[PDB]
Design a protein around this motif. Structure first.
Motif, PDB file in Angstrom:
ATOM      1  N   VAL A 243     -54.744  58.932 -24.078  1.00 43.89           N
ATOM      2  CA  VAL A 243     -54.206  59.613 -22.991  1.00 43.89           C
ATOM      3  C   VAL A 243     -54.847  60.301 -22.111  1.00 43.89           C
ATOM      4  O   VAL A 243     -54.639  61.433 -21.374  1.00 43.89           O
ATOM      5  N   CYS A 244     -56.135  59.846 -22.206  1.00 43.26           N
ATOM      6  CA  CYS A 244     -57.277  60.461 -21.446  1.00 43.26           C
ATOM      7  C   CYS A 244     -57.042  60.528 -19.906  1.00 43.26           C
ATOM      8  O   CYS A 244     -57.007  61.367 -19.226  1.00 43.26           O
ATOM      9  N   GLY A 245     -56.474  59.126 -19.650  1.00 47.65           N
ATOM     10  CA  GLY A 245     -55.893  58.983 -18.376  1.00 47.65           C
ATOM     11  C   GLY A 245     -57.099  58.345 -17.210  1.00 47.65           C
ATOM     12  O   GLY A 245     -57.056  58.151 -16.460  1.00 47.65           O
ATOM     13  N   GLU A 246     -58.303  58.487 -18.087  1.00 48.83           N
ATOM     14  CA  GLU A 246     -59.612  57.528 -17.370  1.00 48.83           C
ATOM     15  C   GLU A 246     -60.106  56.527 -18.132  1.00 48.83           C
ATOM     16  O   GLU A 246     -59.683  56.360 -19.363  1.00 48.83           O
ATOM     17  N   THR A 247     -60.882  55.564 -17.526  1.00 48.08           N
ATOM     18  CA  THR A 247     -61.456  54.601 -18.072  1.00 48.08           C
ATOM     19  C   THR A 247     -62.732  54.650 -18.114  1.00 48.08           C
ATOM     20  O   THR A 247     -63.350  55.610 -17.659  1.00 48.08           O
ATOM     21  N   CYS A 248     -63.620  53.538 -18.778  1.00 50.65           N
ATOM     22  CA  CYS A 248     -64.935  53.654 -19.070  1.00 50.65           C
ATOM     23  C   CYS A 248     -65.296  52.227 -19.228  1.00 50.65           C
ATOM     24  O   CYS A 248     -65.855  51.712 -20.459  1.00 50.65           O
ATOM     25  N   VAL A 249     -65.271  51.367 -18.106  1.00 49.33           N
ATOM     26  CA  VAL A 249     -65.746  49.935 -18.219  1.00 49.33           C
ATOM     27  C   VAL A 249     -67.038  49.732 -18.152  1.00 49.33           C
ATOM     28  O   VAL A 249     -67.685  48.914 -18.413  1.00 49.33           O
ATOM     29  N   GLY A 250     -67.785  50.757 -17.754  1.00 49.55           N
ATOM     30  CA  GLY A 250     -69.221  51.150 -17.594  1.00 49.55           C
ATOM     31  C   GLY A 250     -69.756  51.702 -18.739  1.00 49.55           C
ATOM     32  O   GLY A 250     -70.946  51.835 -18.924  1.00 49.55           O
ATOM     33  N   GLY A 251     -68.904  52.418 -19.402  1.00 52.68           N
ATOM     34  CA  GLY A 251     -69.369  53.000 -20.459  1.00 52.68           C
ATOM     35  C   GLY A 251     -69.468  54.755 -20.382  1.00 52.68           C
ATOM     36  O   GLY A 251     -70.339  55.345 -21.002  1.00 52.68           O
ATOM     37  N   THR A 252     -68.764  55.127 -19.342  1.00 57.61           N
ATOM     38  CA  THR A 252     -68.582  56.526 -18.662  1.00 57.61           C
ATOM     39  C   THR A 252     -67.379  56.547 -18.458  1.00 57.61           C
ATOM     40  O   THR A 252     -67.009  56.461 -17.258  1.00 57.61           O
ATOM     41  N   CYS A 253     -66.810  57.531 -19.324  1.00 62.58           N
ATOM     42  CA  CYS A 253     -65.289  58.028 -18.864  1.00 62.58           C
ATOM     43  C   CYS A 253     -65.154  58.613 -17.632  1.00 62.58           C
ATOM     44  O   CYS A 253     -64.487  58.489 -16.607  1.00 62.58           O
TER      45      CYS A 253
END
Length: 29
Positions: free
Chosen positions: A5-15
């Motif tokens: 439920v962070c609401g952010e992603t990390c497709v690059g490995g960095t939320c």
């Protein structure tokens, strides 16, 4: 801290967000 439920992603490995737990595909709290 695991809760997706962070609401952010990390497709690059960095939320990009603090107090987050990049778990991919989306970070967690």
């Amino acid at each position: 801290n695991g809760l997706p439920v962070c609401g952010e992603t990390c497709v690059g490995g960095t939320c990009n967000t603090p107090g987050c737990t990049c778990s991919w595909p989306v970070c967690t709290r």
